[PDB]
């Protein structure tokens, strides 16, 4: 949505990849398949978890007994009381509604970002040794087998080749 990746130049997700949120799909001479990025998916989970915990944990309410009783000759304080109840009701409803909206836009942008970053980390690592397709996919000019796969994943990619 914001980083051009998810629902962008990579238009589709993988029902096939069920190991993590972000991860690769190799296509070499030893077979195919999906493999979720270990470090990336783990961090996202931790941080998204922390996010959810914050919105919740920061709510430490006072011990109060809402609701009071007034006789027929105290309609005024009864309405004052109703006003303070309707006030808190409007504040909390509005804030909660917008908190969720705002945070939801940040959460998707957060995920969108991690994808873009994963793509970039691979791209600024294979430079000439491969070409971009445009669909978030690269094509190797140099035969890349399985242990030639990982050097990219592990982020430890040499550069001796043609």
């Amino acid at each position: 949505g914001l980083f051009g990746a998810i629902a962008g130049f990579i238009e589709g997700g993988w029902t096939g990849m069920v190991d993590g949120w972000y991860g690769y799909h190799h296509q070499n001479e030893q077979g195919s398949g999906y493999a979720a990025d270990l470090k990336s998916t783990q961090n996202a989970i931790d941080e998204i978890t922390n996010k959810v915990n914050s919105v919740i944990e920061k709510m430490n309410t006072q011990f109060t007994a809402v609701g009071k009783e007034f006789n027929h000759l105290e309609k005024r304080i009864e309405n004052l009381n109703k006003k303070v109840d309707d006030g808190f009701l409007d504040i909390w409803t509005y804030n909660a509604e917008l908190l969720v909206l705002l945070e939801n836009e940040r959460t998707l942008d957060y995920h969108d970002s991690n994808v873009k970053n994963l793509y970039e980390k691979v791209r600024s690592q294979l430079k000439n040794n491969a070409k971009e397709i445009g669909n978030g996919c690269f094509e190797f000019y140099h035969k890349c087998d399985n242990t030639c796969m990982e050097s990219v994943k592990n982020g430890t990619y040499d550069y001796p080749k043609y």
């Binding site: 998810i6 629902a7 990579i10 238009e11 589709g12 997700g13 993988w14 990849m17 069920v18 993590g20 949120w21 972000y22 991860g23 690769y24 799909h25 190799h26 296509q27 070499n28 001479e29 959810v52 919105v55 919740i56 709510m59 309410t61 006072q62 011990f63 109060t64 007994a65 809402v66 609701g67 009071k68 009783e69 006789n71 105290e74 009701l89 909390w92 409803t93 909660a96 509604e97 969720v100 909206l101 945070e103 939801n104 836009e105 959460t107 998707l108 995920h111 969108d112 994808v115 994963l118 691979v122 397709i133 978030g136 996919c137 690269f138 094509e139 190797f140 087998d145 796969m149 990219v152």
Partner: protein, 321 residues
């Protein structure tokens, strides 16, 4: 040989909203809004609520003949009243500062009912037996409040009475009493022979003299007369004095009481239960970690904030494809 990258998707049908887009289907999410109570008047800290059943606070404390069988307790976190409770003041009259009394009684640490003025040794110059009425019926028979004694004149005599109790307890004592206002001057001398009478109740802090207002009120429960109910909290080591030439519904039972501020009174039909809760509503208890609830505005305890929202789904996963 190809090495690409992408994301995750599933059979998820969860939809969330953002600032920019509505009904966006996500892979995963969670609900920040609580909308589920157990439908039980569960207890609060670990203390149970005081359920009054067919009686209200008034009836329970005054000792209405009907309010017999609920009160063997020592403490309560809050008070429960049923919308169908009407056994309160059987004899027509005004309960002074009633709502205040209820608020103070809403939560009690210790609560014991003791006989402050024993019927038989304290009122020797007055009849402590003829004080009944058709207004407060106990199975057909004419009865009265248990915790109060309606003192009438003994065979054509009502000498000035003067009793006074001193709080030897280590907690405040709730003392209740009544001032009877007869309907006719004939009823006045019939009950307490003197025509011009007065009641006085005083402590270290409380002090007031009462003059009986004799007149004909519209019949409520057959009584054209009225009976005003008064109460006060006498401090430990303090004493309260009574002094009457008639018309004084004297205290029989008082209440040694230690109260903790900050509870309430729930009017609900919902069943009382042996369960634990941190937040109580009239509809049921809430067992939640979520920040917001849309169950009920009126709440007791440490509760999530009341919101008018129908749903507050928070996106945790990504888009879905």
């Amino acid at each position: 040989d190809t090495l690409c990258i992408g994301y995750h998707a599933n059979n998820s049908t969860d939809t969330v909203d953002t600032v920019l887009e509505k009904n966006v289907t996500v892979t995963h999410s969670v609900n920040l809004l609580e909308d589920k109570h157990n439908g039980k008047l569960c207890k609060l800290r670990g203390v149970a609520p005081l359920h009054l059943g067919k009686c209200n606070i008034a009836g329970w404390i005054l000792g209405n003949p009907e309010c017999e069988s609920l009160s063997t307790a020592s403490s309560w976190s809050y008070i429960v009243e049923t919308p169908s409770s009407d056994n309160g003041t059987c004899y027509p009259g005004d309960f002074i500062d009633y709502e205040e009394l209820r608020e103070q009684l809403s939560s009690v640490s210790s609560f014991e009912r003791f006989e402050i003025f024993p019927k038989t040794s304290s009122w020797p110059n007055h009849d402590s037996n003829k004080g009944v009425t058709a207004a407060c019926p106990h199975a057909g028979a004419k009865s009265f409040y248990k915790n109060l004694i309606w003192l009438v004149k003994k065979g054509n005599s009502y000498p000035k009475l003067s009793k006074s109790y001193i709080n030897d307890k280590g907690k405040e004592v709730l003392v209740l009493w009544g001032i009877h206002h007869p309907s006719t001057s004939a009823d006045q001398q019939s009950l307490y022979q003197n025509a011009d009478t007065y009641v006085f109740v005083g402590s270290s802090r409380y002090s007031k003299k009462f003059k009986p207002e004799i007149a004909i009120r519209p019949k409520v429960r057959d009584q054209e007369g009225r009976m005003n109910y008064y109460w006060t909290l006498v401090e430990p080591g303090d004493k309260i004095t009574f002094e009457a030439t008639g018309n004084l519904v004297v205290p029989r039972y008082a209440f040694a009481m230690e109260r903790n501020a900050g509870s309430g009174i729930i009017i609900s039909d919902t069943p009382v239960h042996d369960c634990n809760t941190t937040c109580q509503t009239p509809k049921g208890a809430i067992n939640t970690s979520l920040p917001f609830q849309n169950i009920h505005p009126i709440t007791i305890g440490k509760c999530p904030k009341y919101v008018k929202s129908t749903k507050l789904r928070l996106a945790t996963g990504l888009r879905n494809i």
